[model samples]
Every structure is written in C-alpha cells, then in structure tokens.
Target: MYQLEKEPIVGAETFYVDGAANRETKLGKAGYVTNRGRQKVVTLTDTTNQKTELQAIYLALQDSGLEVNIVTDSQYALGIITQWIHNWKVKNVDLVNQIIEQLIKKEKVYLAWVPAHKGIGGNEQVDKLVSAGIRKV
Candidate 1:
C-alpha cells in the first residue's frame, strides 16, 4: 500500500462496529484496524456500531498522516458533525469531545455511507455482510 505513486488505500471498517481499536502499522500488520475491517466479515450490533465506527475513524486518522476517506454505514452522530451543520440538526447526539474535535480539526478524515439491503448493491451481499458480522443474539 505504500510506495507513494498510488497513494495507498488503507480501508478500515467494523463488520458492523463495536469496541476499541489497536493498530500496528509498522510491522507488516500488527494491531490497529479492528477485526471487523479485516475479519472474514463485519459484525451486527446495537447503535454502538455508530460509536464504534467513529472510534474506528478517529483511530485511523490519529495514526495516519495521509488524508484518508472513510466509507461507512453508521449515520446519526456522524451527520451532526457536518462541516456544514447549518443545513440541519440531529437529536440525541452523544459523542466524545476528542473524536468530534479530530473530525473538525483534522482535514484528512472523510466519511461516506455504505447502505444495507436496498437501493444499492446485490441484496445478497448486504445480507451476507449482516449475517457475517458479530450478532448480538
């Protein structure tokens, strides 16, 4: 992924999301990027996925100096952080200060959505992703 010319695409995500991050980028791949992103498939959890996803985003940016775009499905809290918050507003937004600040201060981190089962992609792929993720039940 390194070597400059192509600008390594370090894609990080949570199967569905939930937990803390511990990445190790210097040794070929040690412990950053959660298992969800590198696992056989992501997980399915409560709204914690939203927080988890943001944590993943924050962790990724905190470590990497290069500008990276984060593709995610977790909404809500992420929306409230709009570099353009004047358009609209969200309710019940509860997030950490450091994370919110990183998003606002760091110009490198970006976000995009990964919708599930409708209006996008093979319905089967969506199902598989959901099924593959860490199920709460």
Candidate 2:
C-alpha cells in the first residue's frame, strides 16, 4: 500500500480536471488544476474518447489520495462514477468508475455536475487547459 503524502489541509487545495480528444486525428489529453491554480496535464495515447476524459478525474484523485470535490461537465462520466459504478464493477469494466468508486469510499471526494459553456471559472479554465494539453504534441 502507498502512503498518503500529507494530511490535506481542510479546504486547502481543490483541483479541476478536463480532457480534450480529437477522434479524427487520434489525439487525446486531460488537464487538472489545483485550487491554488497549479495545473497538471495528461496525454491520452489511445482510443475511446470519453474514457480518457473520465480517467482524468480518476487519475487526479488517485494520485492525490485525499478528499476533494471534483466538478465535471460530462454527466455521462460523472454518472458512471457517482451512481452506476457499483453495477459496472460486477462487469469488471469501466476502470474510471472503478477508480472513482474506490477513492470516494476511502477519501471525501464529491462529484458534481456543471453545464459546459457556462461562466464557471473552474470549468472555463479546464476548457483552456485541455486545449493546451492537446496542443503540446
């Protein structure tokens, strides 16, 4: 088992994750940001569009190993994690769901939905960073 780095300060750091994928060009990437505005970007080298984006949220929480609130615009991705993960588990698929379920069980991660193209700052930043993540290839 891996040890958590440090006790996350209460309301100390919050991060946002988002991904961009180009199916035609075979490009994909994910971007995450801390509440303090530190950004982390991930490149997805494989197929299946939404999976990579969903995986962004999972990987963010997985790496941190702490409680946090994750805001996502994709309801499909959010649903699999927050609601349908348990049933999906029986099939041993949807690794994003698998990881997210595990995190919420041990940590205090909360998932909420926000409509895309809105004025939300976090979501807005996610959009820009996701574009940046995809461009660096």
- Find the candidate with the highest TM-score and give its number: 2
lDDT for residue 131 in candidate 1, whole number 0-100: 31
For all predictions, the C-alpha RMSD in Å is 10.8, 5.8
lDDT (CA) for every model shown? Answer: 0.39, 0.65
Error of 2 at 64 (Å): 2.6
Query: Least accurate stretch of 10 residues (summed lDDT) in model 1?
Result: 22-31
Clash count list over all predictions: 12, 1
Residues 1-137, model 1: lDDT tens digits: 11111222356332222132112211111112332444222322333444445554455546544455544444643464553333322422454455555555543454555564444333223334433323333
How far does residue 50 in candidate 1 sit from its true spot (Å)? Answer: 3.2
> What are the clashing pairs of model 2?
14-35
TM-score of every model versus the real structure = 0.43, 0.74
Error of 1 at 10 (Å): 12
Q: Name the TM-score of candidate 1.
A: 0.43
